[PDB]
């Protein structure tokens, strides 16, 4: 109910994304995995491929929800792969 007096991570980030990814895909792609919010996700766009430069940020309603989606998606034997190439998941990194 305000600002955090400490830190405990609470946001995920996608790495190695194809230039054919959009906000609609990520939405329906993470639909059965969890619930997101337009005001909680910032999908950077590039002027070269008129699409993400191979990176996307996603935040969850809570902190645990972050690890959950990370442990739930990584719990599956076959990693995340969509038309383009293999997709991985990582925690919020500095810069």
Short mmCIF file of C-alpha atoms in Angstrom, two decimals:
data_model
loop_
_atom_site.label_atom_id
_atom_site.label_comp_id
_atom_site.label_asym_id
_atom_site.label_seq_id
_atom_site.Cartn_x
_atom_site.Cartn_y
_atom_site.Cartn_z
CA UNK A 1 0.00 0.00 0.00
CA UNK A 2 2.82 2.37 -0.93
CA UNK A 3 6.58 2.25 -1.53
CA UNK A 4 8.73 -0.75 -0.64
CA UNK A 5 11.17 -0.31 2.24
CA UNK A 6 13.38 -2.97 0.65
CA UNK A 7 13.84 -5.15 -2.43
CA UNK A 8 12.83 -8.71 -3.29
CA UNK A 9 12.46 -8.72 -7.08
CA UNK A 10 9.03 -8.80 -8.72
CA UNK A 11 9.52 -8.51 -12.48
CA UNK A 12 10.56 -10.83 -15.31
CA UNK A 13 12.32 -10.21 -18.61
CA UNK A 14 12.42 -12.08 -21.91
CA UNK A 15 15.71 -12.61 -23.76
CA UNK A 16 16.51 -13.62 -27.34
CA UNK A 17 13.17 -12.62 -28.87
CA UNK A 18 12.41 -12.69 -32.60
CA UNK A 19 11.60 -9.47 -34.54
CA UNK A 20 8.19 -10.97 -35.35
CA UNK A 21 6.92 -10.69 -31.78
CA UNK A 22 4.09 -8.33 -30.86
CA UNK A 23 2.08 -7.23 -27.82
CA UNK A 24 -0.82 -9.42 -28.94
CA UNK A 25 1.30 -12.57 -29.09
CA UNK A 26 2.91 -12.16 -25.67
CA UNK A 27 -0.58 -11.55 -24.31
CA UNK A 28 -2.19 -14.72 -25.66
CA UNK A 29 1.10 -16.56 -25.13
CA UNK A 30 1.14 -15.85 -21.39
CA UNK A 31 -2.65 -16.05 -21.05
CA UNK A 32 -2.78 -19.69 -19.81
CA UNK A 33 0.42 -19.11 -17.85
CA UNK A 34 -0.71 -16.05 -15.90
CA UNK A 35 -2.45 -12.67 -16.03
CA UNK A 36 -0.66 -9.51 -17.15
CA UNK A 37 -1.58 -5.82 -17.36
CA UNK A 38 -0.97 -3.31 -20.15
CA UNK A 39 0.12 -0.78 -17.51
CA UNK A 40 2.45 -3.39 -16.01
CA UNK A 41 4.31 -4.35 -19.19
CA UNK A 42 6.56 -2.21 -21.38
CA UNK A 43 7.38 -3.84 -24.71
CA UNK A 44 10.16 -1.76 -26.24
CA UNK A 45 9.93 -1.25 -30.00
CA UNK A 46 12.66 -0.78 -32.61
CA UNK A 47 12.68 1.52 -35.64
CA UNK A 48 14.73 -0.95 -37.68
CA UNK A 49 12.43 -3.98 -37.66
CA UNK A 50 9.45 -1.93 -36.50
CA UNK A 51 9.40 -4.42 -33.63
CA UNK A 52 11.12 -5.26 -30.33
CA UNK A 53 14.91 -5.26 -30.61
CA UNK A 54 14.97 -8.76 -29.09
CA UNK A 55 13.91 -7.76 -25.57
CA UNK A 56 10.72 -7.28 -23.54
CA UNK A 57 9.91 -6.40 -19.92
CA UNK A 58 6.99 -7.83 -17.93
CA UNK A 59 5.88 -7.15 -14.35
CA UNK A 60 3.42 -9.13 -12.21
CA UNK A 61 0.82 -8.00 -9.68
CA UNK A 62 2.95 -9.41 -6.85
CA UNK A 63 6.50 -10.61 -6.25
CA UNK A 64 5.76 -14.32 -5.83
CA UNK A 65 3.76 -14.22 -9.06
CA UNK A 66 7.01 -13.37 -10.84
CA UNK A 67 8.90 -16.44 -9.64
CA UNK A 68 5.78 -18.52 -10.17
CA UNK A 69 5.51 -17.66 -13.86
CA UNK A 70 9.26 -18.26 -14.04
CA UNK A 71 9.09 -21.61 -12.25
CA UNK A 72 5.87 -22.58 -14.03
CA UNK A 73 7.20 -21.82 -17.52
CA UNK A 74 10.63 -23.28 -16.78
CA UNK A 75 9.03 -26.31 -15.12
CA UNK A 76 7.97 -27.50 -18.56
CA UNK A 77 10.44 -29.89 -20.18
CA UNK A 78 10.47 -28.09 -23.58
CA UNK A 79 11.67 -24.43 -23.14
CA UNK A 80 9.67 -21.56 -24.62
CA UNK A 81 9.83 -21.63 -28.42
CA UNK A 82 7.74 -19.62 -30.88
CA UNK A 83 7.94 -19.25 -34.67
CA UNK A 84 11.41 -17.73 -34.93
CA UNK A 85 13.73 -19.32 -32.38
CA UNK A 86 14.20 -20.55 -28.81
CA UNK A 87 13.04 -18.23 -26.02
CA UNK A 88 14.44 -18.07 -22.48
CA UNK A 89 13.40 -16.39 -19.22
CA UNK A 90 15.43 -14.41 -16.69
CA UNK A 91 14.89 -12.22 -13.63
CA UNK A 92 15.12 -8.43 -13.58
CA UNK A 93 18.75 -7.60 -14.34
CA UNK A 94 20.58 -4.31 -13.79
CA UNK A 95 20.50 -2.21 -16.96
#
